[PDB]
Every structure is written in C-alpha cells, then in structure tokens.
Design an enzyme around this catalytic site. Structure first.
Site, PDB file in Angstrom:
ATOM      1  N   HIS A  25       0.845  -1.191   0.000  1.00 53.96           N
ATOM      2  CA  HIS A  25       0.000   0.000   0.000  1.00 53.96           C
ATOM      3  C   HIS A  25       0.880   1.241   0.000  1.00 53.96           C
ATOM      4  O   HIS A  25       1.367   1.653   1.067  1.00 53.96           O
ATOM      5  CB  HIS A  25      -0.914   0.005   1.223  1.00 53.96           C
ATOM      6  CG  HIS A  25      -1.770  -1.220   1.355  1.00 53.96           C
ATOM      7  ND1 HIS A  25      -1.248  -2.471   1.622  1.00 53.96           N
ATOM      8  CD2 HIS A  25      -3.112  -1.382   1.278  1.00 53.96           C
ATOM      9  CE1 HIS A  25      -2.231  -3.350   1.693  1.00 53.96           C
ATOM     10  NE2 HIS A  25      -3.372  -2.716   1.484  1.00 53.96           N
ATOM     11  N   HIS A 259      -4.279   3.256  -3.280  1.00 55.71           N
ATOM     12  CA  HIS A 259      -4.462   2.814  -1.900  1.00 55.71           C
ATOM     13  C   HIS A 259      -3.664   1.541  -1.604  1.00 55.71           C
ATOM     14  O   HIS A 259      -2.859   1.507  -0.665  1.00 55.71           O
ATOM     15  CB  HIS A 259      -5.938   2.583  -1.585  1.00 55.71           C
ATOM     16  CG  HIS A 259      -6.135   1.710  -0.388  1.00 55.71           C
ATOM     17  ND1 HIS A 259      -6.002   2.179   0.904  1.00 55.71           N
ATOM     18  CD2 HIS A 259      -6.364   0.378  -0.283  1.00 55.71           C
ATOM     19  CE1 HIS A 259      -6.182   1.181   1.751  1.00 55.71           C
ATOM     20  NE2 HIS A 259      -6.404   0.078   1.056  1.00 55.71           N
ATOM     21  N   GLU A 410     -16.442  -3.134  25.796  1.00 61.04           N
ATOM     22  CA  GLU A 410     -15.651  -4.366  25.909  1.00 61.04           C
ATOM     23  C   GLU A 410     -14.489  -4.374  24.923  1.00 61.04           C
ATOM     24  O   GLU A 410     -13.371  -4.784  25.267  1.00 61.04           O
ATOM     25  CB  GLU A 410     -16.536  -5.594  25.682  1.00 61.04           C
ATOM     26  CG  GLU A 410     -17.649  -5.770  26.705  1.00 61.04           C
ATOM     27  CD  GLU A 410     -18.894  -4.954  26.411  1.00 61.04           C
ATOM     28  OE1 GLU A 410     -19.039  -4.462  25.277  1.00 61.04           O
ATOM     29  OE2 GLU A 410     -19.735  -4.816  27.331  1.00 61.04           O
ATOM     30  N   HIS A 472     -27.646 -13.830  26.745  1.00 66.47           N
ATOM     31  CA  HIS A 472     -26.571 -13.731  27.725  1.00 66.47           C
ATOM     32  C   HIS A 472     -25.871 -15.050  28.029  1.00 66.47           C
ATOM     33  O   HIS A 472     -24.717 -15.024  28.469  1.00 66.47           O
ATOM     34  CB  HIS A 472     -27.112 -13.161  29.045  1.00 66.47           C
ATOM     35  CG  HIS A 472     -27.278 -11.675  29.031  1.00 66.47           C
ATOM     36  ND1 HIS A 472     -28.026 -11.022  28.077  1.00 66.47           N
ATOM     37  CD2 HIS A 472     -26.791 -10.713  29.851  1.00 66.47           C
ATOM     38  CE1 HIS A 472     -27.999  -9.719  28.308  1.00 66.47           C
ATOM     39  NE2 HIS A 472     -27.254  -9.505  29.379  1.00 66.47           N
TER      40      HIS A 472
HETATM   41  C1  LIG Z   1     -22.840  -5.491  25.074  1.00 65.14           C
HETATM   42  C2  LIG Z   1     -23.254  -5.577  26.509  1.00 65.14           C
HETATM   43  N1  LIG Z   1     -22.307  -5.365  27.432  1.00 65.14           N
HETATM   44  C3  LIG Z   1     -22.691  -5.468  28.707  1.00 65.14           C
HETATM   45  C4  LIG Z   1     -23.974  -5.761  29.104  1.00 65.14           C
HETATM   46  C5  LIG Z   1     -24.346  -5.845  30.550  1.00 65.14           C
HETATM   47  N2  LIG Z   1     -25.341  -4.820  30.926  1.00 65.14           N
HETATM   48  C6  LIG Z   1     -26.654  -4.971  30.802  1.00 65.14           C
HETATM   49  S1  LIG Z   1     -27.499  -3.600  31.288  1.00 65.14           S
HETATM   50  C7  LIG Z   1     -26.016  -2.776  31.625  1.00 65.14           C
HETATM   51  C8  LIG Z   1     -26.016  -1.381  32.169  1.00 65.14           C
HETATM   52  C9  LIG Z   1     -26.089  -0.328  31.097  1.00 65.14           C
HETATM   53  O1  LIG Z   1     -26.680   0.852  31.687  1.00 65.14           O
HETATM   54  P1  LIG Z   1     -27.784   1.710  30.990  1.00 65.14           P
HETATM   55  O2  LIG Z   1     -27.887   1.335  29.563  1.00 65.14           O
HETATM   56  O3  LIG Z   1     -27.388   3.126  31.421  1.00 65.14           O
HETATM   57  O4  LIG Z   1     -29.064   1.280  31.785  1.00 65.14           O
HETATM   58  P2  LIG Z   1     -29.936   1.763  33.015  1.00 65.14           P
HETATM   59  O5  LIG Z   1     -29.319   1.035  34.230  1.00 65.14           O
HETATM   60  O6  LIG Z   1     -29.849   3.255  33.129  1.00 65.14           O
HETATM   61  O7  LIG Z   1     -31.299   1.200  32.742  1.00 65.14           O
HETATM   62  C10 LIG Z   1     -24.950  -3.562  31.368  1.00 65.14           C
HETATM   63  C11 LIG Z   1     -23.503  -3.233  31.535  1.00 65.14           C
HETATM   64  C12 LIG Z   1     -24.915  -5.940  28.049  1.00 65.14           C
HETATM   65  N3  LIG Z   1     -26.202  -6.214  28.290  1.00 65.14           N
HETATM   66  N4  LIG Z   1     -24.536  -5.849  26.761  1.00 65.14           N
HETATM   67  C1  LIG Z   2     -11.227  -3.828  11.009  1.00 72.30           C
HETATM   68  C2  LIG Z   2     -10.826  -3.739   9.577  1.00 72.30           C
HETATM   69  N1  LIG Z   2     -11.803  -3.773   8.672  1.00 72.30           N
HETATM   70  C3  LIG Z   2     -11.427  -3.714   7.392  1.00 72.30           C
HETATM   71  C4  LIG Z   2     -10.119  -3.658   6.976  1.00 72.30           C
HETATM   72  C5  LIG Z   2      -9.764  -3.586   5.522  1.00 72.30           C
HETATM   73  N2  LIG Z   2      -9.132  -2.298   5.159  1.00 72.30           N
HETATM   74  C6  LIG Z   2      -7.829  -2.062   5.230  1.00 72.30           C
HETATM   75  S1  LIG Z   2      -7.442  -0.492   4.770  1.00 72.30           S
HETATM   76  C7  LIG Z   2      -9.114  -0.120   4.502  1.00 72.30           C
HETATM   77  C8  LIG Z   2      -9.552   1.222   3.989  1.00 72.30           C
HETATM   78  C9  LIG Z   2      -9.584   2.295   5.044  1.00 72.30           C
HETATM   79  O1  LIG Z   2      -9.061   3.512   4.457  1.00 72.30           O
HETATM   80  P1  LIG Z   2      -8.267   4.591   5.264  1.00 72.30           P
HETATM   81  O2  LIG Z   2      -8.171   4.127   6.666  1.00 72.30           O
HETATM   82  O3  LIG Z   2      -8.926   5.949   4.939  1.00 72.30           O
HETATM   83  O4  LIG Z   2      -6.874   4.581   4.564  1.00 72.30           O
HETATM   84  P2  LIG Z   2      -6.213   5.094   3.220  1.00 72.30           P
HETATM   85  O5  LIG Z   2      -6.745   4.342   2.043  1.00 72.30           O
HETATM   86  O6  LIG Z   2      -6.613   6.591   3.171  1.00 72.30           O
HETATM   87  O7  LIG Z   2      -4.729   4.934   3.449  1.00 72.30           O
HETATM   88  C10 LIG Z   2      -9.892  -1.202   4.759  1.00 72.30           C
HETATM   89  C11 LIG Z   2     -11.377  -1.306   4.653  1.00 72.30           C
HETATM   90  C12 LIG Z   2      -9.147  -3.622   8.019  1.00 72.30           C
HETATM   91  N3  LIG Z   2      -7.836  -3.550   7.761  1.00 72.30           N
HETATM   92  N4  LIG Z   2      -9.520  -3.670   9.310  1.00 72.30           N
END
Ligand SMILES: Cc1ncc(C[n+]2csc(CCOP(=O)(O)OP(=O)(O)O)c2C)c(N)n1
Ligand SMILES: Cc1ncc(C[n+]2csc(CCOP(=O)(O)OP(=O)(O)O)c2C)c(N)n1
Ligand SMILES: [Mg+2]
Ligand SMILES: [Mg+2]
Lengths: 674, 678
Positions: A25, A259, A410, A472
């Site tokens: 690239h 690219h 995460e 979950h």
């Molecule tokens: C991707 C993901 N990561 C973690 C969880 C665990 N989880 C469930 S509810 C929650 C709290 C998120 O808080 P918010 O969306 O502010 O809810 P509120 O307590 O205000 O209802 C978490 C961490 C999940 N459900 N999904």
């Molecule tokens: C998570 C992820 N998804 C997809 C790709 C494939 N990929 C590599 S470079 C690229 C294009 C992104 O372009 P940019 O970051 O603007 O770079 P440029 O072409 O300007 O150098 C893609 C989709 C990757 N490397 N990683």
C-alpha cells in the site's frame, strides 16, 4: 539539507518497497511523509540503539496498511532494520511483514492492521505512562515523562472502537496522547462522502479532546505548530492533517487506485520526476542518512535519562527498585512461596462459592502482593467482582490508582489493555460477561498474536446464570477461545482451581488468559497436594478407580460436581469410573505424551465429556466411541436449576448415558479399538 | 384520566412483574414510563390485532434489560399478552423472557439485551422503510409511511456500535428514525461521570442528526413537543430525555441499586404510596385498560391503509403484486428453474476463478431476478466483489437503489442488516474479509438466535490471501461459525458450489448464511447432475473409488483440488480413495442417517480432513483413527503459494499422510483379524 528531500526519502523507499514486493500500500505512506518527517526528526524522543528505553516516546501507526511508512522511518533513523529488510517487504520470514508486527522488527510498538485497534492500543499506552508517572514521579524526579503519538486514517475513525477508545481517553484526560488523522478523503470504496460524513472535529470536541482542525499535512510549519500546541494542551489532541493520498504520483494521487496496489514502473518514474527525487530503487544518499539519523540524539537522550534515574534511585531506593522490577516484568520477591501457600490454604479450607467470588478472593489475596495490578471491568464491577479492598479508580486528576471503570466498552477495554501490557510496568486485567467477550473478540486474538499478557475475567459462563436468557447464556464462546492459537482458557471448577488459574494468568506474560467463572456456587473438591500441583497441567485425575477405569468422565468448571456425583452412583453399582477435571484444554494439550496417556489412556474409549457448552468441541477428547453431555442449542430464560434439568445436566442423565455407553462395549466392541 | 396515572400503570406492572420473578430490572421501566405513555398513546401508529401490519410504526427497546416496559406496553395497549404472561416473567417457556425475544411474543420487533444492537437494528429498520418507500411510493399513493422509534440508555451510547450505526444513519438522512436517550446519569458501576462524560448532543450533531437536548422525561408536554419536532425534521432525531431511574421509589431511585434487582416488598409499598397507585399486584382498573387500548384506533388505521393499498393496486397492479410478494417473503415466480439453469450452466461450462469472483457472478445472475436485493460491503466493494451491473448505491436524496456503502463498520453493518431482514421487503447481504467477521461476531449470533436472514460475503478466507499476513489470514474463524447454533456456513470449492451456496442463502430466511469465498482461483470439479443436486446436502461424494473405499479424504473450499490430486496419485499407486466435498458441515449434519452413512461409512475409519483452517474442529468427522491436515498456528506474511507449501498443503504431504495412516490402520486391523468376536 532541505526538509522536503528528507520527507521524499520516505516516499521513495515506500513506493520502491511496495513495487519490489508487487504487493502493499503506497498511498498512505506517501500522503503522510511530511507529517512523519516533522514528527520524527523534530519532536520524537527515542534511541534507535535501544528500542526498549523505558522513557522513549511511543509511536503507533494505526492505519497499519501503510507499513512501508514505519519501516522507512525505522531504517532511515538508524534502527537495526536494513535496506535488505526493506527489499524483503512481505516476503517469507522477513522482518517486514505486510502489516507491522510487534517483535518482528525493532521499534515496532504494536501489531496493527485491524482498523481501530492501533489508536486504542495507543490510548492504553498513554494510560500506562500517566499511571506510572503518578505512581513513581517525585518532586524534582520525574522519571516517567513521554508522549504517545498515533497516525490514523478514515477507517480507524469509522470503526466503533475508536468511539470507545477516544470517549474514555477524553474522560481520563490523556493530555500526552497526540493523534494525527490522515484526512485524505479516500477509502477503499473511493471518495468517502457517500459513507463517511461526520463532522470529525466536532465529534472529538464532544469527547473533550483538544482538536486542531484544517492542518495542511504537507506544510512542515503548520505541522510543527500543531504538534507544539498539542504538547501544551492538557487534553488529548486530535490533529486533523489534510493530505493527498499518494502525494507525488501525477496520475494516481487523490485516488483509491494508489491505496493498495503497486504504482507500476511507469508511474513510479513519473513520481520521482514530480518530487525531484533522483536516486534509484533503495538508494539513499549518505547526506540523507546523516540528516535522518537519530542515533546520537537518542543515545544522548537515554544517557541523560539514565542519569535522571540514577538521581531518583539515590533519593528513593525502594521506589527505584519497584520501578525496575515492574518495567522488567518481574514477579514480587516471595511470589511463588506466598501464592502457593494461599492456594494450599484454600484447599485446606473448603468453601462452596461461585468461582466469580473465588476470583475476587484471589484478587484480594494476590493483589496485596501486586502493586502493578491495573484491573477493571466494562461496567460490571458488582457482577464480575473485580474490585477488592485495595482497588482505587483512575480519574483524570489522579492516576495513582490501580482500577479502571471502562464503561460499556468491551472492545475498547480489551485493546486498551493490549496497549497497557505492551507499554510495560503493569499486570492488566479486565472483565465482562463471557457472552460479551464476543464484542472484544478480535482484540483478544490480537493479544494472542502479539504474545502479550491480557487477563480477562469472564463471568456468568453458561446457562447457570439463569433468567437473563439466551442473549446472555454462553454456549459456543468457550470453544471459540479454545480453538484460538496461543489463547489460554481456564474454566475452574472450584475456588482452588480458581486461585491456580489466577496465579498462572499473572505469570502468563507471553499471551492472553481467559478466566471463565460461574455465576452460581460451586462445590469444592478434595485434592492431594500432588493433585493441587497438577491443576496447572490443565487436565488431571480428580477421582480414580481402584484398577484401570472402565469409564472416564471428563468435566470442566461447574459440571465437575455433576461428574463426581454420577461417578459415585456408578461406583456403588459396581463400575470403575475415573473423573478427569479439565480446567484448561490448552495446558493439557502441551503436557508430554506420557502425562496425557496417564490421564486419558488411549485404551479406555468409554469416555463422557460433560460441559454446559457446545458439544461438538469435545470430539477431540472422546472421539467416535465416547459421548458428550453438552449444549447443542441456545439457552432459555428461566431459573438456572430448571435449565440444567431441561438440558440434561442431571446425575440421572449422566448415569443413564454411562450405562448405555458401557453396554456398547459388550461383545468386545470396545477392546477391538486401537 | 390524568396522564400520570396511565404511566404509573406501567410502573406498577413492571415492579410487580420483577418482584414475582425475584429477578429483572425495574429501574429503566419506571424511568421511562412517562415517555412511553406519550409515545404509545399519543403518536404510535400500530394495530394490536395485527402485529404484522406492513405500515405499522416500529418500536425498539434497545436498553433491553428493561423488558417489563415493553411487556407492560403490549399488555396495556391490547396485544395478545395477558396478565398471566406478565406473571410468568423470566419463567421457563413463558412469552416474557428476561430480555425480549422476537418471534414468540406479539409486538416484539427484535431481540435485544446486548447493548447497542437495538438502536443499530432500528437504523436498518428505518433504512428498510425509506428504501421501500422510494421503490414503491407513487404520486398520491404513499403506501409506505411509518416511523422507527427507539429507546436507548447510556450503555448503548458508550458502545462502539452506536457510533457505527448513528454516523451512517446521519449520512443517509434517516429522518423517520426517532431515538429517545434515557439520560439518567446511572449505569451498573454507579454514577457514570467517572467513565461516561461525552457531550452527547454535540456528538450526535456531528453525525448530522437533529438533536433536542435537555427534555424533561417526566413532562408529557415537553416529551410531546419533542416528538412533533422530531417528526418534522428530515434528519434523524435524538431526543435527550432526562429521567430518574426507578422514578417513584423513595429509597432506590436515582441509584444503581434499582438497576437490576427487585425493589423488595416494602420498597414497592412505599413506591405505590409515592406514586398514588392504589391497586394490588397485577391489578389494572378498567378505565386504565380503556384509556390504554389501541384496538379501535389500530383497527381503523389498518383499515385505512388497506383501502390505500387497494387504490394503489388499482393504479399500479404490477408494483402492487411486487410489494405483496416481497413483503410476504416470497421468491420470484420462476426462481427454482431459473436458478437451477444458472447452476447447470456453470457445471457445463468450467471456469477456474476465485470463489469471490464466482460470488460476483452469482450476484449478477441471480440479482437480475431479485429486485428485493439489498447488498453492501464494509468498504470492500472492489475486494469482496459485491457490486454487479444492477447495483445502485443508496443516497440520502435517492433511496431507490439496492446497495449500501457501509463504510468501515462491520458490526454496525451486520446488525443494521438484522433490522432490514426483520422489517421485511428485502433480501439483504453484506460483506467483509472473513477475519473481520470477528468485529461483527455477536450480530451474527443474534441473527442465528432470532432466526432471521442475514447473508454475509466473507472473502479472503485462508492463508491463500498471502502477503497481508496473520492479522488478516483466517485460521479459526470458519470453525467458530460452524460451532454457532443455527449458523449455516458454506465454503464452496468452485464456481458451481458457489452458485449453489448463494441460491440456498437467498432461500434461507430462518437463519444467517456465512458464505466463505477465496481470494485465489479455484479449479472447477466435474459433477454428475446428482452430484450437483447433492451440493445442497452440505457434504457428498465428489470422487468415489472402485469398490468400497479404504481411505476417505474430506475437504472444503480451496483444499478440495488438493484432495482430488492426492487421491489421483494414491489411486495410481493402487489404493481405493474416496473424496468427499464438505461445503457446509451444518447442512451435512442435518441429513438423515442413511445419507450420512453413505457419504462417511462407519466401517471406513482411515479418514483425512484437509482444510486451511484450525485442525481441532475436524475431530468430529475423523475421530481418533483419522488424520487432519490443517492449521495449528496463526499465519505469516508471505506469498500465498509459499504459505500453502510451508504449512503442509501439498500433494506430497497429503499422500505421505495417507500412506502412513493406511499402514498404521492395516497393522492394527491385522492384530485383530483372527479374533472371533465381531
Ligand atoms: C454489550 C453488553 N455489554 C454489557 C452488558 C451488561 N449490561 C446490561 S445492562 C447494563 C447497564 C447499562 O446501563 P444503561 O444502559 O445506562 O441502563 P440503566 O441502568 O440506566 O437502565 C450492562 C452493563 C450488556 N447487556 N450488553
Ligand atoms: C477492522 C478492519 N476492517 C477492514 C479492513 C480492511 N481495510 C484495510 S485499509 C481499509 C480502507 C480504510 O481507508 P483509510 O483508513 O482511509 O486509509 P487510506 O486508504 O486513506 O490509506 C480497509 C477497509 C481492516 N484492515 N480492518
Ligand atoms: Mg483515508
Ligand atoms: Mg443509564
């Protein structure tokens, strides 16, 4: 010598390296050459003779596909990376793989390529610097003081993990993190307007960043001024450098044609003309080498820092010794003695607790010995139980602590932790429900690939979590970790296995550790001291028959008690039954043939694997003549005891399966196996 | 009735449902009850008697843990969800699981729980409405006209996928998407200021959204004004509704204690007093039911839409039959014979092309018959080969097309597609390198859990991609897809298997399809017409031996050619070798015992599985007595042909492995031969 000639050396090596490989690239390396030159020649503090100088600045190339850019920088400035290495770009076993790889070439700070993770690693390294500085710097002795620079493109910014990393970096006030956005308007699909139209400056202001918009990426004066402003602002800085991708190519610059394909010999000759570069492939004039060399500046900077540290060591000998020990990744003085005593105490003092609680108890027992702990959770501290009495949260105005509230992030948390481990000085751990390992999946793969320590506390590991239901309840997650190269996956069956898994994880510095913990309570098993020591072997005989077993139950985590109870009923019915606890298949696989045959003798084909997870994984250990009691479907929302009964994790089902299996061994149908 | 009393019926049912289950999340339902009452009773166009009405508004609870909110709304407004159902919250086989599940309870538009995916699903739902409108609406005949409403919390906004979904939704001008952010300052760890401090209105402004900040989420008039403003603005709207979590509870409100635990009997009594709700557990007065019922308004609304469609059909009969066909999920009239002719033509006309090119050829050939196609790629159109001649990109100002430039947003693309598939009217497909399936992994799982179509073109499937190296080179990813329940994973070995895989994926409307395509050219194999038909069985005999085989080679994708060549050599040296092509193990697993025994007989234990992927998956098909030729490490950056040779994917290694295997197995047979038992 004029600046533009120095920047043009990057462009020539990049386009020549890609052309000789007929792969790679050239676009981004040619577009960012000016920025790299200003940063590297004008501001970066590093010693090419010691790529591990503790107080070096850290550079990360997050748009990792422009790998010839960093290879060009390392060679030009005097790292142990030769012209022949560049001539071997993307070739078998070279130091210059197609995407930059940690430990493949000196000065590569992390492996990049998966977009978004470079900037996230850099957020981690900035967090490590700031915490080390807050934990070790004393009045008049600031022995931790370096910046984190990142180049990123549009791809990194489109990825969701950039939102996780940079939102948290704003909250935590990472003022020494300085990111250059290669704003060139192009991605693989072409002109990005159709799919990427953020007000990117406004977005980063919303994160509380310092943003320098509309920087001419080919004006060395504007670039220098932006970097100076960045180093002075106490918030992380986004520098929006507008560049032309493939800068120098008359016909392919500002196009996605440059690219990720070689330019071709004709276009390359035309580019040399356009840039006024009159040297052939891989020829760098000695004048350029002179002006690019960083060896004597870097040797002087490290020598100065070594004196700075010697002063610090005279005034604070205990702290200096701690700093040395942690940046070298060394365990505390009495680690082995104390950690083993803790484990034997647990085996002496049975508790029937959830292994997530045993995990918290291990953090409390071991963490008193480990000031290098940098723990956290993705917003699940009260369910993963990742805090102990000594946990102190990091905040923007106080980074002396040892615990990070990652929020619901995460993927960002896991790749931030890769950056922390790469930086040195800490043992990082993170946590979420095992199900949401899937959100962070590729960052865990990147830890395995880079061979860095990344400890994940994954709780709520099966239908045992109950009512929250099939979105979950893990089923296939444990197996997908077991099938990953250089992943260590531990599913402890009680508090003793739990503490062993934690001890090994803390010691495991050449790869990630997935620690799989139950929501529900787990019965402690009796173990001799030899059996305790054999936990670390990943699979060991937990209960044995007198004489050779006619049936072997292999079980993991919460299902071990089920195996033990079924083996008790079968033993009382006359059967010779062995129970094998298999906390870590990957550790069991690495034991010698003699040990493995001692645990799972090849001539005993009547084996049953028992695990609240996807069954198909277990053909590796039971083959065609065994049976598997596991999951074949998603779970259900209900109380856990009803789920275990519905899905067959019952003593009766194990006993019946065993008797049916033993009946298939009649008529010598089992003994014929060889 | 007072508005607040109708909202408090939500709070009462929610906390009583959580208490009876001794499990679940009462906080967010109580926090958003006022917003829900205004939206549902004052704006939502829906028919409780037909949850499938095509022009209904779509509502999505993205903070899925507050599931008692949507169950309360459904029961209160007249859906077939009873008081007894609410009394079975979180109980085995109930219509009210702990997180809402599409497919069982009426009115549940998607399955949520994994934070961030609900709002992303809604983006796709709003994308489907806007495209269906552009493709079918005519002057004076706007048969497609509904809104997409989403509730979401801080967790959904911290998640990276919200960045992917909302950035793209801004770019695409999804003005009929109206999202309510539950801005209550709380998540599970507690007060969020230590980990969540974005300027969220400014963030969404940067996405080109219409933002209404600082809406009092307990002020019906303000909530109502916000919605009207939202519907008038042509940009997607974020309504920033400040609420108190667990609103009403004297001691747990505004605190993470009411997030995910039952309030407790004493707190619930104090809460009833605080809300002025004087009714016992699950007791809803008759005038509350009458004020909440959407049955009469809803039946009138659908009746009106049916007349609008009768008028449309009279004016535009061909468009109307197409709308009905696509909304009913039916394939075009002559799909089976025309698709089979395409496939028979490929078998008849051999071509050694990369299966990713064969993918493009199938898109072209099948796409002419499928105006319902809605394709895309995550910024890899020229590598995934997802665009054909009939591809037309969606644009904010023109949604009549059939192709989405998703940008570098694998997770957002995949969960948007679940939304598109749930909405109806389209056959969606997306694409990325197989490696970056890992970025989108849990959205693929959600498709499988929900049993919705989601077709993914995953290209560059092995070390065959070459120099990009091990961050790109898949090893264990195919096996991870194969272990996922209700995942269909296809690794076609040539252009014929490629077209069959695409045909079956287009037909596969109850689950996702992962289509695994090569970067490099693949040799076409010869097949009888019966063998062509047995591709669809997931595993079949490609090359049989003369008489019972003594050795079986099982191969997929790019490694089938390798197995064919090795068998050829082994047969020349006198061995009896069978080659089994296994494009999809999950389809093979579903065949009956006779068919599977006919392909893989239990007598023949000398088997070798050959695949440029992680080895340990194949123990299911080779057992302890076979061998596996696959990967046991990450890859390395080098030209593809040097990688294949270095990692053992050569004819020499396969032949040497077979010969050792046979000598071993003939040796152990010999020790047993004279024994008299069976
Ligand atoms: C991707 C993901 N990561 C973690 C969880 C665990 N989880 C469930 S509810 C929650 C709290 C998120 O808080 P918010 O969306 O502010 O809810 P509120 O307590 O205000 O209802 C978490 C961490 C999940 N459900 N999904
Ligand atoms: C998570 C992820 N998804 C997809 C790709 C494939 N990929 C590599 S470079 C690229 C294009 C992104 O372009 P940019 O970051 O603007 O770079 P440029 O072409 O300007 O150098 C893609 C989709 C990757 N490397 N990683
Ligand atoms: Mg770009
Ligand atoms: Mg909240």
């Amino acid at each position: 010598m004029d600046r533009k000639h120095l920047a043009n050396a990057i462009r020539a090596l990049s386009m020549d390296g890609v052309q000789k490989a007929n792969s790679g690239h050239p676009g981004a390396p040619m577009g960012m050459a000016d920025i790299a030159e200003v940063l590297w020649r004008g501001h970066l503090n590093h010693n090419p003779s010691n790529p591990e100088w503790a107080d070096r600045d850290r550079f990360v190339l997050s748009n990792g596909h422009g790998s010839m850019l960093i290879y060009s920088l390392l060679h030009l400035s005097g790292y142990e990376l030769s012209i022949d290495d560049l001539k071997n770009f993307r070739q078998l076993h070279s130091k210059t793989p197609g995407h930059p790889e940690y430990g493949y070439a000196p000065g590569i700070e992390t492996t990049t390529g998966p977009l978004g993770q470079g900037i996230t690693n850099a957020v981690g390294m900035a967090m490590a610097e700031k915490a080390l500085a807050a934990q070790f710097n004393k009045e008049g002795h600031d022995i931790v003081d370096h910046f984190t620079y990142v180049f990123m493109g549009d791809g990194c910014l489109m990825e969701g993990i950039s939102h996780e990393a940079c939102s948290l970096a704003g909250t935590l006030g990472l003022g020494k993190l300085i990111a250059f956005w290669d704003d060139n308007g192009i991605s693989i699909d072409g002109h990005v307007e159709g799919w990427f139209s953020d007000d990117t400056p406004k977005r980063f202001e919303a994160y509380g960043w310092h943003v320098i918009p509309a920087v001419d990426g080919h004006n060395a004066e504007a670039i220098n001024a932006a970097i100076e402003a960045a180093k002075a602002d106490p918030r992380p800085t986004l520098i929006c450098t507008k560049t032309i991708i493939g800068f120098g190519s008359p016909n392919k610059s500002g196009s996605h044609d440059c690219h990720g394909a070689p330019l071709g010999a004709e276009e390359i000759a035309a580019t040399r003309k356009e840039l006024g570069w009159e040297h052939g492939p891989f020829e760098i004039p000695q004048e350029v080498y002179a002006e690019w060399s960083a060896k004597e500046a870097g040797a002087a900077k490290e020598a100065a820092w070594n004196e700075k540290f010697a002063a610090y060591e005279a005034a604070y000998p205990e702290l200096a010794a701690e700093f040395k020990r942690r940046v070298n990744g060394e365990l505390p003085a009495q680690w082995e003695e104390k950690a083993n005593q803790i484990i034997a105490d647990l085996q002496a003092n049975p508790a029937n607790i959830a292994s997530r609680k045993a995990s918290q108890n291990a953090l409390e027992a071991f963490g008193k010995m480990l000031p290098e702990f940098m723990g956290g959770s993705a917003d699940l501290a009260p369910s993963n139980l990742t805090m102990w009495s000594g946990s102190k949260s990091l905040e923007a105005s106080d980074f002396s602590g040892n615990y990070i509230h990652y929020g619901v992030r995460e993927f960002g948390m896991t790749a931030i932790m890769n950056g922390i481990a790469l930086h040195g000085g800490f043992v990082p751990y993170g946590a979420t429900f095992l199900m949401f390992m899937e959100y962070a999946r590729n960052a865990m793969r990147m830890a395995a690939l880079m061979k860095v320590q990344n400890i994940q506390v994954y709780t709520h590991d099966s239908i045992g979590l109950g009512e929250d239901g099939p979105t979950h309840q893990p089923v296939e997650q444990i197996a997908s970790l077991r099938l990953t190269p250089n992943m260590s996956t531990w599913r402890p069956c009680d508090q003793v296995e739990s503490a062993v898994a934690w001890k090994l994880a803390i010691e495991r510095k050449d790869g990630p550790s997935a620690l799989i913990f139950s929501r529900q309570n787990l019965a402690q098993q009796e173990r001799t001291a030899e059996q305790v020591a054999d936990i670390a072997k990943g699979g060991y005989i937990l209960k044995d028959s007198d004489g050779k077993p006619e049936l072997i139950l292999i079980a993991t985590g919460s299902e071990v008690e089920l195996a033990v109870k079924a083996a008790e009923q079968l033993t009382a019915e006359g059967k010779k039954v062995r129970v094998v606890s298999m906390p870590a298949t990957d550790a069991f696989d690495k034991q010698d043939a003699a040990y493995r045959e001692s645990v799972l003798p090849s001539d005993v084909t009547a084996r049953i694997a028992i695990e609240a997870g996807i069954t198909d994984f277990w053909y590796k250990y039971v083959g065609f003549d065994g049976r598997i009691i596991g999951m074949t479907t998603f779970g259900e929302s209900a109380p856990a005891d009803q789920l275990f009964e519905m899905f067959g994790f019952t003593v009766e089902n194990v006993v019946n399966t065993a008797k049916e299996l033993l009946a298939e061994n009649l008529y010598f149908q089992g003994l014929e196996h060889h």
